[model samples]
Target: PKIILPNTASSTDTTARFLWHAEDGDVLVIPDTVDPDFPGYVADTLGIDGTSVHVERTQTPLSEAVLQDPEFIDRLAAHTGTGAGWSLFPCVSTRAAAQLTRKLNVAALDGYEFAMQNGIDLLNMKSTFRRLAAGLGTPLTDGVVARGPAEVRSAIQELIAETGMVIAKQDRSGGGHGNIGISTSPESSFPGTREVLAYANDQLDTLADTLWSQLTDTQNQFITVETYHRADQRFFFEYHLDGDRARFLHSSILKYESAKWIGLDSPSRSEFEATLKPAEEFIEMIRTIGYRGYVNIDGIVLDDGRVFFHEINARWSGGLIYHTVAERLLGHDYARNNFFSSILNVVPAGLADLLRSLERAGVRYDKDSGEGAVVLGCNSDLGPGAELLVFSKDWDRLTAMKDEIATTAGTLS
Candidate 1:
């Protein structure tokens, strides 16, 4: 059993993802304002007998939720004492967990002091690990460093000579919001630096605004420009590293519409194997830095059959629970058995109505055919539009059932 503190920022709503991972005796510190129906549904689906699945209600995100409240922490310290562990399943480690482990003598299952320091040092910016990525000998697109709008325009002008398209990224950005695309037509020809610069500034302005909004302490409109390479495939890999060795937890093909992450599926083993070496080495590098906990690496497969390491997320990602949920509902190594999952943007009256229609469609993944869906994500006080994870044995089965399921259950005619 573990204490889970899944904080949310500008990224996806991640507190609910823990529901799929919670077991008999696990404790979840959920937002007090969260939809009661959502948590209650989770308890009904995944809760087990003889286990006290404590729900500690609080108003804020981190230590503020559990710490400071001596009454709560006092009760929790005894509850989690001896053999129980603490898990800070957020972006980085917190002094909150530090307090629990040190002051209260409760063991932090993940995110110790050293781990916290390492994660903070490396994850502070996108460029923090660029030097490490270069050390891996992975070929990357050409890039230019720019700090101001004028410098950005010049960099874009220079990169246009190499590629017709480019992407701009902030040093520290979350979600998929900070990425911007700069496209050019092959037939277009421009010689003047001024014209190209002006066009580049126009393209980068919105993204610059986004980056500026997220900036803290002296950061103002910084961006990294890279020649855009069309990715033939996308991937998110979760690795488990213990005792100086890094191994894979799962490798799921990421389904997305550019910045919008739709869902995930298990790709061919060869596709997953292609990413192994870089991923292992990447994990090893971070582990050497003394960082530990859940690690998810996002990358892309190019048309030329090369995989590029895009970014590293050193936390319990939003999709982290999908694999385990399948394991329990289906079986172990479900990804190996060729399971696929994507979000179900369904229409419904309420949680109760959604439950009714899900069964009506007869799509809840059955163990026999390996064809059905699961109630994956939901966040509403009293309304429709909760996310679902529809799955099947293979791409064909999933695709066949998806449209039919969505029509009956999602749209709810």
Candidate 2:
């Protein structure tokens, strides 16, 4: 049995419930109460009686909450006794997760001790990604890591001089939260920013300083400034690392809306397969430190046709649930015969409403035919929106269904 703790940044709302669809007979320890309807739908879809799903009353990090509750520990101990012993599977193997692993007296599937000593925090850092990727000869945008604001301005100026634009990033921030782009012309569009700005070449100094101030406001130790590319294509090369080896899982094409990450489609363009050779080599190097399991490297193909890899997420990623459900419904080669689009924060309805709408519209995923939409999860705090996945054998229909699902659901609140 596996003790699955989706202890991610937004554990309760997204990871906890979405991941429930991917596993059976596993122990899920989440900090908040889950909408029972979501899991009920998942269990029916998966055809199971539903395994142990525990809700920790105190909505804190699972590691902290578990230690504070002796009864919970005892219950987990008994659950482990029923199986061939449990192994830990956390979203990211943190020190807290490692400590909990010790308390449970069970092995972590990713090797908790190895992860703690090798430094998951250190490995996840963008600065560290730069150092390691450079060594592996992975193609990357021209960039520099800077400490103080003065140094940041200098690096930004240098990169912008080369590409007419630059992206400033906080070293430790993940996804697109710590990323912002600056451009010399308003015509340039960046994937994760809200407004596209046009700055004259002469104004780069002030622009750099202003951007650096925003970057520093987050309390980061370092900032990475790189040439901002108007990427022709962007994708994530997913991989799974076992003992002493790393294997390519699949490639997912990323989608951005209004300068923010919104959706991803897979299996992405096969023309980008050449980029995987170096990516596989890079993850193999990451494997030597005893860090194992799922990891996905972010890559973008420039208009010039050059592929540049940036950032490595050494944990379960947003695309994992998509791939997991895809494989379950359509088999391992699901990508060969189907097209999948996993859109986030787009649905304008709650879980119950969205589910009913999809079924009423005849767009819900059919287990037998293995097509249509799958509601991944919803954020109650965000109100009336959910992460949705639509898949089909027909590319045109798949896209049409995605739009149909949204149009029928109405607008965001």
Please name the candidate that would achieve the greatest TM-score relative to the true structure: 2
Predictions: Cα RMSD each: 5.5, 3.1
Model 1 lDDT per residue over 251-367, tens place: 777654433445556653334566777777777877777666677777777788977776777766656677777777667767756666656345634556666766777776565
lDDT of 1 at 62: 57
- Residue 390, candidate 1: C-alpha displacement in angstroms: 2.1
Residue ranges of candidate 2 with Cα displaced over 4 Å: 8-12, 51-58, 63-75, 81-83, 194-206, 217-219, 270-273, 348-350, 380-384, 411-413
The TM-score, computed over Cα atoms with residue i paired to residue i, of candidate 1 is 0.81
Residues forming the 10-long window of minimal summed lDDT in candidate 2: 377-386
Total clashing pairs in model 1 = 3
Range of the 10 consecutive residues with the lowest summed lDDT in candidate 1: 189-198
